[model samples]
Target chain A: SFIKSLENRRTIYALGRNVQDEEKVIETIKEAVRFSPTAFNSQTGRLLILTGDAQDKLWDEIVAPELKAAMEAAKLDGFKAAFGTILFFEDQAVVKNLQEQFALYADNFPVWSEQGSGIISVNVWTALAELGLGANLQHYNPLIDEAVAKEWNLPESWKLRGQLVFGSIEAPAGEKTFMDDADRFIVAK
Target chain B: SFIKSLENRRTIYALGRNVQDEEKVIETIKEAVRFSPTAFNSQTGRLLILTGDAQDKLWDEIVAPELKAAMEAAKLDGFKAAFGTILFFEDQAVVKNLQEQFALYADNFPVWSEQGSGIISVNVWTALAELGLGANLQHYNPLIDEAVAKEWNLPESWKLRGQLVFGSIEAPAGEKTFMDDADRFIVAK
Candidate 1:
């Protein structure tokens, strides 16, 4: 059963190791996110795949421009191990139509879109796990997307959502915590 | 192994099915979304749960709404079998912090947040599937969040993201699709 499959699902954090199959990782991750449901199937997502010299060059650009002093002081060994990074972008023009169609509060659709984006990230992580690659969800999008788009000449509409850094793992993800079930769950019926 | 588990994974869909354990479904779903990775673990996403009479009333509201009336009316039978909805939402206030921390383009954060939202929705679906219940990802959030929030006296900050109606699938979902490896993946040394 699908439920049993998730019985002990783990979110692994790749340590200092590299993934051998970068191409496979990208396809696996992208499929999971693209097929994920969105508000009205708006499918308002843009995915940017970065790997090889391009991936390293990207980290270099971001760190160089934003944290030059830090880079000069210390090498980024952790960043080096990741095979590649995936950036999910949301297109606002697509979501605006959702608002009109849904009769949502003028402010709701945009935020709702973010919620959808979050789910896609989980799907990618789980899908990657299915492929035997480990990954961690990173929040470097705001710091990196602009320079990334400018450097890549990507469309202005492609606004970055989250960064997923993946690789073969040296250490597994830290244990996750949860509030007690009794406090969180209530059954009225 | 988790890798083997992927083969059995299916996006379960059923119609006119009663929930065996309603509280567990809601609690697990909310937990999955809340703990689901967001841009900085800043859980900007919110969930709106609708069930019982509230659930039926929502489909009724959608059926009566102006623009979507025709489709909603035609799908009345389809909507009846669905038991509940989980509305995914994101808060702008959360995105503001992400922008400040990352030093990203001011306008880009909101758009990127949608992509993040998608990741959360995937988690909900996957997590729910792990439970005994089977379900499908639906987009009633576009049509339901605002009015439903008003009825529930939810916070204005609780923006509507997307909706998932859970029960049993009366019909099967279409086959999932993906491009070949060449189009989707890349290898890097």
Candidate 2:
């Protein structure tokens, strides 16, 4: 069931580089993002997947230092230790086009773009977790966005949103608790 | 397996109020939102669901008149036809607290709240679809925010994000095509 997939997906911190069948993993990840929904079918979601030397360049070269003091060194090392990292983004050009096309709802396009990014990330994360991999999400955007674009030569319009670092699960995500659902939901039935 | 769920979760426009188990559907929808991830475990997402007289009050009394000229009048009727409409929101108070607590990353708090809104909505939509319900997303927020709060007596801090109106499927969501994945993805190995 879909609920099972959502429940099983967790913020796994300990990652390992032991993985085979790179082609299958890459294709599966792409399919997950491709199928995710965007508002108005805008198709604004974009992604950058880095592994091996490229992944090393991301955390070791850029992410490690800028996030040097912001987060624990061990956490930074945790991302660096992952098999790969998938950076999520939304094409501002597509959002801009939608803004012009639907002038009345101009303000909503940007919010929709971020929401689309969220959908794409979770689908990809859950799919990967079910395939026997583990992942954790990060918000190093706006801070790491510049160095990433410069390194990968990504388009300026492909604005950064979230990052998911994934690999074989070396350690499990601990249990999580939720606030009372009654407080979070209002069901006028 | 999860990919199949994603593939099947399409936007169904035609809906019917033929639901048999209101409790099961509501609980399932709640479970889907509860399991979705939020940045820094902030859990900023909240939802307001309207059904029966309350649902009619929402569409007939509020959304329809406001979005009247902005969209097809038939579309507004389509929403009113659904079994219920779920209004997505983010707890601005929670976001504000996160901002003050994590003062260095204050600016990103609001963005994270919206992202959490996205994750929660998609998970709920998919889980509902998997349980034989169909849904269509709407972006009448900002336009419909104030009246919705007043009608439902929702707290001011529960800022609107998106809406998902769902019921039994009466018509199919047609085929969707994607842009070239290459232009949208960068695989660096």
Candidate 3:
């Protein structure tokens, strides 16, 4: 059953506005992430789940201008088609406090903080996939961070790490290829 | 089923030698990480699945010495009890190539590389949890990197990030706590 779910999950870029129930999907994501593990149980992962006008607003008002400035405006329309978007962030304030408190491992906390966000992001992504929604992971951060912060009135300490844009499955993901297992794993018994 | 799996997955530290089928578990991990998504499909995640004598060697020869030196000898017995260990690394060689080719994102590739590892790690962790196996994610890297690389003949470019020590569930994980969901998530309709 686990492998079945993982097989169903893929990078689905072509999304549509055919979700049966957006609220249930959002609830699923919240529940999945709420239980997602973090370093020292720091709970540093933060999410902004946007749907309807809010999703469109983020794609248009914040993400679109940046893409246009970079001459990648065409990409903006792709994300705009999605039914919802989850903006992922890491709370640097909490990470910094842990670093100071555990100075012996100060250098490791920063990367660990981001790792926590990664775990949470994938949890939500696969949860959405299981719910018959397709999503793609995007990183329009640093580009949209300032404008996003202003629009959402987010704290300065919460740094954007990645974004998940998801909706109904408009199309299946293209076939995926793997690196030679010889290269990716070593079975040492 | 996805949320059910997520809720069931927790950090179980008191592991024991009670896996149903070690080889089957190994194959499941291989499948999960092989399909886990990465930025640009770099597929930089690499794994070393150690069991039996190899697992014993890692704990007794390398990790135990370091823990004693750090005055954390008490923690050694806990990890040694695990049936196997999965050492997670990011192939810096592949990441460097991507960074050079995608010069625009050169600054971000490193972080994204680590983030990719996070996604794969959680995918595998939950995969194991669903199989009724208990595992805990641990970071003994940089501390054990040189010894691990030399002993396992790992490439110098493979930077160790985290290790997942897993086995049969001897005891359930302790009671877990949660931060107020109101603080961790926001829903904008």
Candidate lDDT values, in order? 0.61, 0.89, 0.88
Find the candidate with the highest TM-score and give its number. 3
* Per-residue lDDT over A93-161 for candidate 2, one digit per residue giving the tens place of the 0 to 100 score: 999999999997888889888888888999999998888899998888878988999989999999998
Model 1 segments beyond 4 Å from truth?
A1-14, A18-27, A30-35, A38-54, A61-77, A89-117, A130-133, A139-160, A171-189, B1-14, B61-73, B91-113, B130-146, B175-189
Task: Answer with 1 or 3, whichever has the higher TM-score.
Answer: 3
CAPRI tier for the interface of model 3: high
Q: Which residues of candidate 2, in runs, are more than 4 Å off?
A: A67-73, B68-73
Q: Please report the TM-score between candidate 1 and the true structure.
A: 0.68
Model 1's DockQ score? 0.25
For model 1, the docking class works out as: acceptable
Per model, the share of native interface contacts recovered reads 0.28, 0.90, 0.87
Q: Which residue pairs collide, candidate 3? A: none
Ranking, lDDT, top scorer first: 2, 3, 1
Task: Kindly give the stretch of ten consecutive residues in candidate 1 chain B with the minimal lDDT sum.
Answer: B1-10
lDDT of 2: 0.89
List, for all models, the DockQ compared with the true complex: 0.25, 0.83, 0.82
